[PDB]
Structures are given as structure tokens and as C-alpha cells.
Amino acid sequence: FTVDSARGIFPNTLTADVVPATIARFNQLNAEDQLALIWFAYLEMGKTITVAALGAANMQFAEITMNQIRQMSFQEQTQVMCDLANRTDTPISRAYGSWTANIKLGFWYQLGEWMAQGIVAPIPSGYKLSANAASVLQAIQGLESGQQITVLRNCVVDMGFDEPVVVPRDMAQRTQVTIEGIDNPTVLNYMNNMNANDFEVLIELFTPDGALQPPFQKPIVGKDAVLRFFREECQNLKLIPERGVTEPADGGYTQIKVTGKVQTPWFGAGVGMNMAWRFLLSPENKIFFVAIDLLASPKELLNLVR
Amino acid sequence: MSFTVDSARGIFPNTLTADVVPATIARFNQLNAEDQLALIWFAYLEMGKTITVAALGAANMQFAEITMNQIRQMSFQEQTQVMCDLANRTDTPISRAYGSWTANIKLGFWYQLGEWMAQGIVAPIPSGYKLSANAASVLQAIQGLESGQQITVLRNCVVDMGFDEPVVVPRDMAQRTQVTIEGIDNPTVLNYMNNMNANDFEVLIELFTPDGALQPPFQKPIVGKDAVLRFFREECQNLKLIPERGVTEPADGGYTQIKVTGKVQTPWFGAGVGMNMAWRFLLSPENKIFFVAIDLLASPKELLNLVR
Ligand SMILES: CC1=C(/C=C/C(C)=C/C=C/C(C)=C/C=C/C=C(C)/C=C/C=C(C)/C=C/C2=C(C)C(=O)CCC2(C)C)C(C)(C)CCC1=O
Ligand SMILES: CC1=C(/C=C/C(C)=C/C=C/C(C)=C/C=C/C=C(C)/C=C/C=C(C)/C=C/C2=C(C)C(=O)CCC2(C)C)C(C)(C)CCC1=O
């Protein structure tokens, strides 16, 4: 096996490719339509946000920028927001591009609160989305909540351009998952370490050259890059695996598929995303490859075909 | 100034473009390399459209001759790996060579490989290959698109693989034709269309302001005469522009906004495929192009969408 050959295990897992499709549609819209579309989608999303994600040492990184924006006029604020959407090369857009996803999300959450408070320039009254933007908004509002929030997140994170430590949860307070059909400690402890933010232990489950493929992204290859990804993107998730299957693969490898739900700290139990994990484990029972997929619909939770 | 390039992008915002094309490309980009190759094989086979002899013998293929002949001599296993390296945008000598090529060389390369696949010279899509669930759905989506949208999906997928010519002679004035656009007599728009059809890019570039920009379908504004002229020379050769209808309206500061709808034919398919397009011009008071966007329209209905 190579990483690229591992990518196709369990090939009839149907993923929610409407998400990258919809993001690509959003990417065609001009900056003002993008900002207005997100405003409308966000307001109409009946899902309340918790800002336990993006903590203090993290959000300290965007404080300077947020203080700059808070001192500009409504016209300068609008230009900055458009520079972000346009991925323009400006000092603030470069600052934004340096941040992790949760810092970017917390930044926009604060601007959104200030917009409802009149502290930051609002979407102009009586604004009309372009014909294409109106159709993108309608498509988003037809998606399952888990897909809606992934579209919004990825659009936010793609904006801009030109990590404090995470201490794991105390052992006594930790939960342990139960996965129907799966007894393998490498899979069980992948989930338990994730749920405890115990990334320095989790990385030891991988082969030295092992790879992790997040939803709609390319494989991240090797312990150094995977550990960096854990530390930067994976804090405070709740993984709720339900059921899985295991089967032998070529050369003494083992392939395992698990389905279940994931909650993000931004929405807690209010949004459950339907996920699959597809593992290829080495003969020594280490993770050579794991893919994490956002599933097309709840019907895919029952698709456990070997 | 009354406009910036980014503020010009939104002119005629009721124009409904075929964003199903970038959406479907994004779905295709989720598939692994072998699935991508098989999907394009079946999509290319299901299309009933023929590539022209004039594009088939394109002299620029000499840049790719050595690489193709190398591939032809490889084993089927090596050939498959090369093709996957291309789909994966891997850093290899062959993928770097492909990434150095122009779009037209890239298309001719894959046309030749596909011919060789049918002739038993290059490794075929394996006989017992089953598309993934996602890939089968993407293939079904492509089959439901208008041919002009199908070929745009296929072209963009080809051009995006890999990584890690002489300019056409303008046609003699005596041999040129003149477009006719119902509703539009603006000479800058007519001159844009006629110079494009004549491959007279050095005259065409003089129609733009120095800070002026051109926005190709599903791409970002290309800003400045140097960048735009390089784009004309590299990409826009031997097209046939068939504008039919248009509307002109005043814009701020004495500018003029013009929308034209019509059809475009690529030299790859000749008259076999007519893509429904809009051109959206923002002209300075001095009659120069400050911004022009070229859109692939969502459906033929949009040819009649000529409201402000
Ligand atoms: C932008 C903007 C606004 C603001 C808008 C705002 C504030 C928008 C905020 C939107 C928010 C807070 C979106 C958060 C989405 C989080 C997701 C999808 C996390 C998924 C994680 C997953 C699947 C993890 C999976 C994982 C598992 C299971 C593993 O096993 C391995 C790890 C891995 C990570 C792969 C305004 C409202 C101001 C209007 C203007 C404007 O433009
Ligand atoms: C890859 C592959 C294969 C091969 C597949 C093959 C051979 C695929 C070949 C596909 C081909 C030949 C696609 C050609 C597409 C051309 C288009 C959309 C031109 C558009 C031009 C336009 C819109 C003009 C626009 C213009 C106007 C009007 C302006 O006014 C301004 C300029 C501008 C340019 C913007 C196999 C079958 C071997 C399988 C394996 C595999 O993977």
C-alpha cells in the first residue's frame, strides 16, 4: 500500500460532495455578495453558537486586528471585510491568513455580534443578492445542518491571505467510546484520545509515515504534519462513533470502517455531523492511513459493506 | 475614479452563469486518481462530439512528443502510474513537463493517450473497474449537462492536472468578417469581437485602459494590458465569437455598461459545440475597456436575459 492507494478503501462510502460543490459556487460570487450571503445564511441558521471554542490565548491573536477594525469608519470596515473575502494582499488579510481556523471563526463571530450592535458596518439595507448568489443561498438552506455548517466554516477559513498548547482532559474525567462490532484498541483509543484532546498520545498510534485525510482535503502525511494538524485544528471535538466493520486487506493490513456522529464545540449537541472513519492499519496494528468523511445523508450511517 | 476592477465584476448581476461547472469540477477533485481517469474515460466516450483534424495535428505537440513516446514505450504498469501522477499533481519529471505545457498541448496529449488506449498501446481503464459511489454520481451529473458545459468540465479537469508557443498570425483584413449585434452599434464592442475573431491581439489590446482587466469564465480578473495580452496570446486563439443580442446602459461617471449574449465555438470542436456566453463590458467615457467579463451561461434561456 501507498497513501494514494489507501485513499480508496471502502469506495462505496457516499460522501457529501455537495459541500465542496457549493463552496465552489460561492467562490464565483463577488466579495459583497459573499459577505451578504453568509450574513443571511447565518441569521437564518436556527443553530446557536457557543464560543468555548476559540479561547483566550487563541483569540488574543486576533485582538489587535479586531481593535483596528473597531476604530475604522463603516466604509473602511467594509473594505477590510471585502479584502478578506477577495483574499487580497493587505496587512490585515495576511494577519488573518496566519491564524488557525478557530481563531478566524471567532474573529468573524465577534464582527457578526458588532454588526447586530451597530459597532461594525452592516449588510446594506435592502441589499439584493445577484441571481447566482440567491441560488447558492437557497442551496445552502436546503442542506442538512451538518453540511450547512461545513460550508460556512470552509468559506470563512478560505478567506484572507495575500498555536498555544492544549492540555488533555484529566484521566479520571475521560469518557470511553463503545463501537458496535469494533474491539481494536487502536481504533478505540484513536477516538478516546481525540475526545480527551490527548494528541501527544494519539500520534503514537500512527506509523511514522502514516497519513490522515480530513473531509474534502488531501492526505496529511507523516507524524510531524499529522501532529501539527491535531494541535491546530482538532481541539474540543466530540466523536460519537456508533458501529464498524473490520476486514483483512492485502499484505497483512487491516481495513476498518466506522460510522457515527461528530459534534464541534461551536454548536455542541445542536449539530451532529454524520461521519465515517476509514482506517488502514499496518500488520503491527498502527494507523497507516485514516480518512474522515462527511457522509451524504443519514442513510450512509448504515453502509458498512466490507 | 468611479470604478475599481473589483466593483466592475458585479455589472449585470442578474446574469445567471453555469456555476454547475465549477461545482462539478469540485466534486471531481474529491475522487482519487484512478477514479478520475476512469470517470473521464466514460464521460469522454458518452459525449458524441468529435475533435477536429486541425487541432489534432497542432504543431505545438512537438513540445510533448518526447514525453508521449516515452510513455508509449513504458509498461502498462508504468503508464498507469504516470497517468495517476498527472491526476494527483505529483512532483515528477513527467508531471513537471506536463505542468510546463500550455492548455492546448495538455489537451492534445490526453487525446493521443486516449487514442492509444483504444488501440491497445496505452494501459486501458481495467476491464473490471467499478467507479466509486461518488464517481458514478459525478459521471451522471456530467452526462446531464449541455455539451458546452461538459466540454468545459473536461477541459478544466485536464488543465488542472500535472505541475509539482508561436502566436497565431492575424487574418488579413480583406478576409475578415464583421459581426452584427441586435441592439449594439458601439464600435469598441464590435472591434473587440472582430479583432478576437481575427486573432489581432495587438490591435485588440489597444481597446483597454492601462488599468483594465479581463475576466474569463470562472477565473479571476486579469489586470493590466501586459497580463491581458499574454492571456490573449496564450489562450484565445482561433475562437469563433458569434454575438447576437445586446443592451447598453449608462454607468457612473460617464461610463457605459454593455451586455452581449451569443455563442462561442472553440477550435477543438468547431461547429459541433456552441457555448452560450455573455460578455459584460464596462467602457470608460473615452470608449476604452476598463473591464470585460466573459461568462458561460446557465442555459439557453439566459441568451434573452438582457435587463439591467
Ligand atoms: C464570515 C461572515 C460572518 C460570520 C459568519 C460566522 C461567525 C460563521 C461561523 C461558522 C461556524 C462557527 C462554523 C463551524 C463549523 C465547524 C465544523 C464544520 C467542524 C467540523 C469538524 C469536523 C468534521 C472534525 C472532524 C475530525 C474527526 C472526527 C477526526 O477523527 C480527525 C480530525 C478531524 C478534524 C478530521 C457574518 C455573519 C459577520 C457576515 C459576513 C461574513 O462574511
Ligand atoms: C484526460 C483523460 C482522457 C482524455 C480526455 C480528453 C481528450 C479531453 C478533451 C477535452 C477537450 C478537447 C475540451 C475542450 C474544451 C474547450 C473549451 C471549453 C473552450 C472554451 C473557450 C471559450 C469558452 C472561449 C472563451 C473566450 C471569449 C469568448 C472571449 O471573448 C475572451 C477570451 C475567452 C478565451 C475567455 C482519457 C479519455 C484518455 C481518459 C483518461 C483521462 O483522464
From TrEMBL, chain A:
Sample GO molecular function, one term: chloride ion binding
Q: Would you say which domain of life the source belongs to?
A: Bacteria
* OCP N-terminal domain residues: 16-162
A Pfam family for this UniProt protein?
Carot_N
Write the record's keywords in alphabetical order, separated by commas: Antenna complex, Chromophore, Membrane, Phycobilisome, Thylakoid
Note the SUPFAM superfamilies from the entry: NTF2-like, Orange carotenoid protein, N-terminal domain
Example of a GO cellular component annotation carried by this entry = phycobilisome
What Gene3D superfamilies does the record point to? 3.10.450.50, Orange carotenoid-binding protein, N-terminal domain
GO biological process entries: light absorption
Q: Which family does it belong to?
A: Belongs to the orange carotenoid-binding protein family.
Protein name as it appears in the record: Orange carotenoid-binding protein
Q: Which organism is it from?
A: Planktothrix agardhii (Oscillatoria agardhii)
